Design a protein around this nucleic acid. Structure first.
Lengths: 592, 593, 597
RNA sequence: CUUAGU
């Protein structure tokens, strides 16, 4: 408390009858060399450091923002010797990769576009109670450190985990608290004009959802999910206020923006030169809506303008290419906003061509093949004795994982050559999403005493293959003979929000309009603004992944999008149930 | 059902042992890939082979970048993986061996100078516990590459044939192998209705000794030739099943997109180099001196590079490659006509050979083997039975009593490389050496130990696997394991071409084969087909063959095999005069019984 | 048969280390038999039972993109040398062990400065452990073999390097002790040097006090003080002379294994012209810039200099901006050095013996078994010790005598410590070496199993670093151990010093004698290391030194200056020890979350 | 581009 150590900002989370959680941020004492260094405390016991740093020299070879987030769950935080044969913390665990995914998802859009300086966020778990979780605290600490560092960060992201306990949404729940919860949610957001804007949502139904609902609780409907989105807003607001608002943490030091280079693809010359002689050339180039005929105009005009523009922009082919891509993106976005028609030629509620075959791989305990248009996932599930379940050791409360879901994404799925080996971060994230989707419906260990492993091999991809993996995995589980509570489905979804000028209504006044469309394609993911994946049974939503940058959407449109999600998931459920309705007889490997 | 399956069937007849069937399906799984084939065997084995091509060539790479990866997914065996992470990570040894088996015949079939990156990912979906999949992987990879619209030469079907009771049964199970004496994985293609063998991998089973004495005929090289002749109908059937109709466009595929080629010396540097640097190469080759050869050949290379560096600028690599090609052509001509080797040795002459025993102190067994520049230090250690490798995979083997580890440090050939995890080359070489040494091993009941034979290549000139076999058997004799019979090895090979003479009014183009012994890196670069043979004085234990020829009659195959046997016999005599009998156990080694 | 009665290119040489009463050792170098294809190959035997191979190879074309010398050292400690199959599930020699990494570090420390400066060819030295006594060590024999092989390779590597391991028992300094002898010893000293003018010119030495140092000292043995350390430095000189003469007997250009040396291109930084221009046009202003002494003024002046002299010179020497930067930093280092020799002033504005801003906080991290935070100057090191049941030791297996590391120190160096960015993954060689140094500094003062039956793991994360953080890690580990309540024999503190030696011409006698003067300074910094002609770090308790490191370049120093530097080390360590004792001095009660075995 | 929680 001598100097630079008195920042000492504090925020409070009032859960009502469940006590108050005291989040605390301090700086200026640890890691003075880093650009930003914030130590975050939860209930004066869970202490973790977050240090953000930036490379001195600008990078030009890289074509994308090289943000890297590493969390390091050092084992001494749990008061135990590491279980590795070398007694050292080796490669990051599955929880420590999900945590940095959760940090990266909202933080990456919060950096200004065109940034090409390496930004590394190291989140070290220096201490942690055996009954608390650090991922949300990791989000808060990383955002606070980046805000302190003076990097071109946006408003300080704030995250909170909220759980439905007997009707109320409790923020930052203890593991024992969420044990009795019925819906786990992680919400990360920022304040824009005095109200919070939702940036990232990660929702998983608790493994005891069925028992709690049968015992008297209420199932997590989409309306409940929207109410919960509205419930965690004050917590995110309070956590954001504890970063810079009122001369605290980053507010004590002020931290005005420091210089940093930006490398945009099209400043003013190439963009104008393509917009002048390209805007009128896309009047009706997407009318057929087919891979065989519609593309024949857009690709041909792309080649024509590429040849024509090669007269003053010598050596800037990437610039004109990016400008053309942005032009066609904006044009087709306007197409959806006005005509209400998609690039693929389908409507906003048109589910892609569905098919689901069961037991296609012999000698396997369970096999299924689920196809949605271009997308196609083969799921294989196998069962062995209880001792074969993974013995997970980590800072996390769990000790044994009896249901493993591994999502394999070989490079031939998209038709391009790559490297087969250790899966990247995104594959682990997709596998975790599918596993969280399938946990709440699995039978209990005593009822069904078999460890479950599920390999989901993506044999064909057109973007957002996790939900098809969920459907294929539940099909395969039904094939293998496991008794589920209810079949599950899942589907991705897009929401395009934009301000369009209307002339008929009074005069030429700009109004903001939203279009919610189903079955996001590979190129439709970049074509919207709020892209979210919803999975569940016909009774409740289990897995919900949401990531956006919009400055808030009304509850009405969010409820409508979730209702459309329920409808489409019901259609997928019907197409799954027609092929297989009951679990089949177990494979000959089943003991008597 | 849904149309678009395009099944094709091949029948493998085995007489009294039972007919098997191979099925090919396409257009159903992994459509987004350039080519995909789901291969079925016996209605219970399925594996998906998919090949893709990079949309842009890798102009930076100096070699054709083909990568074959096999994913032997553990769920095929109906068991959660035993790894602590419950996931299948690094490939096992069997996956690497299957990758080598697929790569070896399939690599040369692509056009020379191709620069696209191509990856063949063969996934093992379902597998019967008693059936093998590597040869089925060869078939599926060849079929998928054929349907992918790639510059593939042709279907490369293959078959595993085992010799049981004088009948060469194709595609045997694991159960039938214990009743067999020789394993022949043969992969080849048909050219004008006759198969042209591409690769051969031959292993004598671990019960060959106990069955040859029991009545079965020994795997003598004549029996080996009979087996290589026996697999031809199976190769033809599998190749025509992979081909069937036009298939690539008539049945399943895509309209062809041309793939660019990057020849090293197209037509400019080669013509000038041949026109201006022909006679000097002949004079240098006919100088008749090994030690004086370099002062002429390197000087000619330098002066040719200097003189030609006036018309061609920036093509120094091209003129160097053209000069190498010219030297290759004249060296092949010299071997065919003048019947001389660049070493100055005869076509049946082994290099300076020597074998020392007990060189490394405080080791359970050690030996050193030298052949000219090749020098291998093989160390074997004897530990308890419990210390055998507990290998678990899709393969039916659940342990490994004898493990051969082939270390190839970068200083073996003077290169400053990277020391660390072994590559695929050394895994394959170690597997070949272990397959050579397995048949002559003592029984586990009579001799209850786990053997870990390390072969460290201390000096290399290419083809050091068979020398590793010799050093391994020497060190095994030194350690004290009772060998069934000493086993040697040799790196054989031959040059095959055509020579035209006017002795019968021109047009007399005779196909000449010359078999030369103790090949080197240069000899590998010159020889058309190079093979390695290992075995005892009675029968052969290991045989590796890799070729590209359109056909060789049984006369030259028998002659080359017999010459290989003679070389093996001489090397065996030298090893015997080094050490003869299993001596006493080393004092440091433990005694359990 | 043996070697078929020599009669070949195989050449043999032997060196007899006359131990005295305890024994006598024989180190034999042989060449020409194994690994003929390598540039150089030497097989080294010790006691006719410890045989290893050393092969040195060089590339045929220098690698241009590397701005430094790309030397690689690999200690392939093959498992069959110990007569046991590896315990790995794959039954193969996997990643290099910790002791193998330490052996590569020991070989690399003196070898790297021996090669001619500016070399770009990739030099790989591979030492393979073929045989080993079950009670003998190999790292010293490994550096001997590596030096011999590099000498036989014909490389511009200058001077055979000898290495000895001297340990003292009951006042007698033996060379190459057996594991039992080092068990009975009270100080071990791995030394390495070269012969310059008929006398050894010491180059590297790492010193560790054995595990039973306190009991041996209380048993009557002389404690390993600074005088004893200097005596050990002096006793290893004849052994280095013998082990260098033996490798020199493999003569060059005389029909022996010494081959002719072919042209070996060397890439310099500032060869002959840019340096002259920089030292002519930017010498007076650069020298006058050091008069103020204000650290902020140093940056304010050096930024202007590096921005304006480059632009001024970027008119005649074009395309060599990095070269002129190299010349500028060389000039700055030279003027700083001459200032240090002349008026005893550092770049930090402190005096020769001025210690940094000491701070030591205890019990920083809550819920941990023990935590401490040590801040020396800008360096800030956090150390967390985790007590646990003895079943959680390290059940390592290797050729070395040890079988279980009861106390394990892990030194984490995240990339944000220095402000730059990187990858937080596997620990590099440097982190392994620093952790080993800290662990060896802490072993002599650790309680035995019977008194405190718990495995001890120390986790020292460098939260902020400015070079020479190993000793800060030692102090922080001691503080954290005291916090956790482990009964220590006595607190141990470390400190990293420097030494700058140069020559000036005294003309007072109108004769102008070129005399070499020495200045010893404490609390070395990140930038002062690049100026110092010698760098060392000393760690000790209140009484005796428990760890030592030395990596020099001078061709020998008098014992007077060495004793003075060691006394300076004692003074700095005593001040630091007083600071820590003020922070905490006694073993307090264990944290409730610690297991009570 | 990299090698131990079997």
């Amino acid at each position: 408390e001598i100097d630079e150590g008195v920042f000492e900002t504090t925020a409070t989370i009032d859960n009502g009858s469940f006590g108050t959680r005291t989040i605390r941020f301090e700086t200026g004492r640890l890691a003075l060399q880093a650009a930003g260094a914030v130590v975050a405390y939860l209930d004066d016991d869970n202490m973790l450091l977050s240090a953000t740093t930036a490379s001195k020299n600008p990078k030009e070879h890289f074509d994308f923002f090289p943000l890297t987030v590493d969390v390091e769950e050092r084992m001494y935080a749990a008061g135990r010797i590491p279980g590795s044969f070398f007694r050292r913390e080796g490669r990051p665990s599955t929880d420590a990769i999900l945590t940095c995914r959760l940090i990266d998802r909202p933080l990456r859009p919060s950096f200004v576009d065109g940034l090409r300086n390496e930004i590394q966020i190291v989140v070290t778990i220096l201490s942690l109670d055996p009954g608390d979780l650090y991922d949300v605290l990791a989000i808060n600490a990383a955002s606070a450190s980046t805000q302190l560092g003076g990097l071109p960060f946006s408003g300080p992201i704030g995250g909170v985990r909220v759980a439905l306990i007997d009707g109320t949404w409790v923020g930052f729940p203890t593991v024992d608290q969420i044990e009795r919860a019925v819906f786990d949610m992680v919400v990360a957001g920022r304040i824009v004009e005095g109200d919070v804007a939702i940036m990232m949502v990660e929702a998983e139904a608790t493994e005891n959802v069925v028992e709690l609902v049968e015992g008297g609780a209420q199932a997590p409907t989409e309306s409940v999910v929207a109410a919960g989105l509205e419930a965690a807003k004050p917590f995110i607001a309070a956590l954001c206020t504890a970063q810079q608002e009122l001369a605290d943490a980053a507010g004590k030091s002020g931290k005005p923006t420091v210089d940093f280079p930006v490398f945009p693809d099209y400043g003013e010359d190439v963009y104008y030169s393509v917009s002048s002689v390209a805007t009128d050339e896309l009047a009706a180039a997407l009318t057929i809506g087919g891979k065989a005929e519609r593309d024949q105009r857009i690709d041909e005009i792309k080649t024509q303008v590429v040849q024509r523009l090669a007269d003053t922009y010598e050596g800037r082919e990437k610039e004109v290419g990016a400008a053309l891509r942005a032009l066609t993106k904006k044009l087709v976005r306007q197409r959806i906003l006005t005509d209400h028609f998609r690039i693929d030629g389908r409507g906003i509620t048109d589910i892609r061509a569905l098919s689901a075959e069961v037991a296609v791989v012999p000698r396997a305990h369970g096999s299924a093949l689920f196809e949605r248009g271009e997308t196609q996932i083969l799921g294989v599930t196998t069962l062995d004795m209880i001792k074969m379940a993974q013995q997970i050791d980590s800072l996390g409360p769990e000790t044994s994982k009896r249901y493993m879901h591994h999502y394999n994404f070989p490079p031939f799925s998209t038709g391009e050559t790559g490297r087969v080996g250790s899966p990247k971060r995104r594959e682990i994230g997709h596998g975790a999403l599918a596993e969280r989707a399938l946990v709440p419906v699995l039978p209990s260990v005593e009822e069904f005493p078999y460890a479950i492993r599920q390999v989901s091999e993506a044999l064909g991809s057109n973007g957002s293959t996790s939900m098809g993996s969920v459907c294929a995995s539940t099909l395969a589980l039904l094939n293998a003979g496991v008794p589920l509570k209810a079949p599950v489905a899942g589907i991705a979804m897009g929401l395009v929000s934009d301000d369009i000028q209307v002339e008929g209504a009074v005069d030429g006044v700009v109004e903001r309009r939203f279009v919610t469309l189903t079955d996001i394609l590979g190129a439709e993911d970049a074509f919207g603004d709020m892209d979210f994946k919803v999975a569940g049974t016909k009774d409740f939503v289990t897995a919900l992944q949401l990531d956006t940058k919009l400055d808030g959407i009304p509850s009405q449109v969010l409820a409508g999008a979730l209702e459309q999600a329920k409808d489409a998931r019901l259609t997928i459920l019907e197409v799954m149930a027609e092929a297989i309705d009951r679990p089949d007889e177990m494979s000959p490997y089943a003991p008597r």
